[PDB]
C-alpha cells in the first residue's frame, strides 16, 4: 500500500473519503483506489473533494 499496508475489500460503507488514497488495479490493465487509512478499495467512487484546483 501507498501509505499503509494493502486494503481489505469493501463492506457497507457510506463513510466520506480519507484522500491519502491512491490509484492502482489489478494486471488486468485496469486501474482501481484504495484508500490506505480506512484500509478501502473501490473503484467506482467518486473523489469527495478537488485538490489545489479548487483550494489551494
Request: charged share 25%.
Amino acid at each position: 500500500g501507498s501509505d499503509l499496508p494493502p486494503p481489505s475489500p469493501p463492506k457497507p460503507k457510506t463513510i466520506v473519503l480519507p484522500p491519502n488514497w491512491k490509484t492502482a488495479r489489478d494486471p488486468e490493465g485496469k486501474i482501481y483506489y484504495y484508500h490506505v487509512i480506512t484500509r478501502q478499495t473501490q473503484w467506482d467512487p467518486p473523489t469527495w473533494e478537488s485538490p489545489g484546483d479548487d483550494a489551494s
